[PDB]
Amino acid sequence: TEAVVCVGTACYTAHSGKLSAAEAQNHCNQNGGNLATVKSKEEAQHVQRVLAQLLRREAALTARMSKFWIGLQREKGKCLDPSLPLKGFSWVGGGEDTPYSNWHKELRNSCISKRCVSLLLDLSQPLLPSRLPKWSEGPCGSPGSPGSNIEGFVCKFSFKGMCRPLALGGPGQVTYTTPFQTTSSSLEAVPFASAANVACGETQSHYFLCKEKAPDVFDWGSSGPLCVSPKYGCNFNNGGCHQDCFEGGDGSFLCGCRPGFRLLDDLVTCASRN
Amino acid sequence: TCGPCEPASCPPLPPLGCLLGETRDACGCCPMCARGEGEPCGGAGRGYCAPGMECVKVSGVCVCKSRYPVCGSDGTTYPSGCQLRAASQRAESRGEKAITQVSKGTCE
Numbered sequence: 229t230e231a232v233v234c235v236g237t238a239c240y241t242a243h244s245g246k247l248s249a250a251e252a253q254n255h256c257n258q259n260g261g262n263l264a265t266v267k268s269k270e271e272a273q274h275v276q277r278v279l280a281q282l283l284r285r286e287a288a289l290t291a292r293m294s295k296f297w298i299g300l301q302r303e304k305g306k307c308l309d310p311s312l313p314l315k316g317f318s319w320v321g322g323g324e325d326t327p328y329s330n331w332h333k334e335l336r337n338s339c340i341s342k343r344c345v346s347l348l349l350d351l352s353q354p355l356l357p358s359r360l361p362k363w364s365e366g367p368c369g370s371p372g373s374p375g376s377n378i379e380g381f382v383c384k385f386s387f388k389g390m391c392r393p394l395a396l397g398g399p400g401q402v403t404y405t406t407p408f409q410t411t412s413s414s415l416e417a418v419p420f421a422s423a424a425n426v427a428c429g430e431t432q433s434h435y436f437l438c439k440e441k442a443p444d445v446f447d448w449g450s451s452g453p454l455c456v457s458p459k460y461g462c463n464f465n466n467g468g469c470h471q472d473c474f475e476g477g478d479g480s481f482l483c484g485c486r487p488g489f490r491l492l493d494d495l496v497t498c499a500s501r502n
Numbered sequence: 503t504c505g506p507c508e509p510a511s512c513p514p515l516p517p518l519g520c521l522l523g524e525t526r527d528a529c530g531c532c533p534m535c536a537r538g539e540g541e542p543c544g545g546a547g548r549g550y551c552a553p554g555m556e557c558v559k560v561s562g563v564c565v566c567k568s569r570y571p572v573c574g575s576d577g578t579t580y581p582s583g584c585q586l587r588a589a590s591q592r593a594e595s596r597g598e599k600a601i602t603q604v605s606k607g608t609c610e
Contacts, residue, residue: 487521487523
């Protein structure tokens with residue numbers, strides 16, 4: 229399972245492998261993205277989760293000090309300016325200078341060598357959102373020689389918006405195909421121009437596509453919960469309903485809203501007037 | 503198939519609003535009220551049961567899952583837990599304090 233977390237209007241993917249920072253940035257560039265950026269303390273947690281679930285696949289196979297390439301490098305030319313929170317570095321995907329940092333040990337005042345930054349992680353200790361991964365500069369490396377403890381990288385993608393996960397009212401499996409070739413079945417948010425192949429049963433095959441229903445509005449096009457089986461009704465996952473699940477017949481149902489709320493066109497999600 | 507959604511051509515909701523729930527019609531359009539105890543439900547132009555209800559039977563009636571009397575915070579025995587909820591949402595609609603389910607059986 230490919231490690232991916234999509235939050236807000238951006239996504240984060242973590243891939244293992246000994247690639248130099250030039251090959252890693254080129255890999256993220258192929259899928260229309262760039263190496264991850266730890267601009268805010270919130271992005272730190274998001275990038276720390278895609279790594280956490282990547283290591284959880286093979287933590288014993290990765291060194292106890294793991295380095296994961298991110299999109300921060302200071303090309304050769306001028307020395308770091310300590311006063312800057314980013315230490316004179318620049319995000320590989322462009323942008324401005326962020327006030328958040330997490331440097332470890334001490335940076336080398338080499339104004340003649342280009343140096344890339346990876347995220348260091350101590351895998352002997354449990355991973356926690358409080359003990360956020362520390363930053364480590366060093367040689368960017370070459371093809372075949374990525375560097376010491378380099379065992380992966382993190383690509384960050386950006387989109388105009390995100391859809392919501394398809395709510396199922398019965399037994400089924402949905403496979404969300406993101407724009408980048410990563411396809412997952414457990415996406416907390418689905419980006420624009422993504423395909424979802426619902427496999428209703430335990431066998432119907434439904435397909436939907438994240439489309440701009442309106443400015444800053446993204447919808448698949450489905451109405452009501454999917455995979456609904458009369459054998460279960462509201463017993464199974466509350467019929468995939470936002471809050472209330474009205475009963476009717478033997479297995480028929482329809483999502484309901486508590487007084488004051490209002491059901492939307494999705495026939496599932498509730499929203500209050502005020 | 504069914505006719506297109508016509509908001510203006512929707513029967514205006516109760517002036518106090520549906521005090522149980524809220525949903526669309528059978529065709530998936532317009533607002534509708536959740537059917538209370540002993541209300542038609544099931545198969546075009548149908549309504550669906552409230553929470554804690556079952557549509558015992560084409561179309562039947564909504565009976566409470568809790569078919570046993572209960573004792574509430576109002577110091578009054580109710581016919582069922584469903585009637586305690588139905589009268590409780592009225593209290594908040596008219597500003598009165600919410601009627602809570604204190605115990606079951608009768609009110610000592």
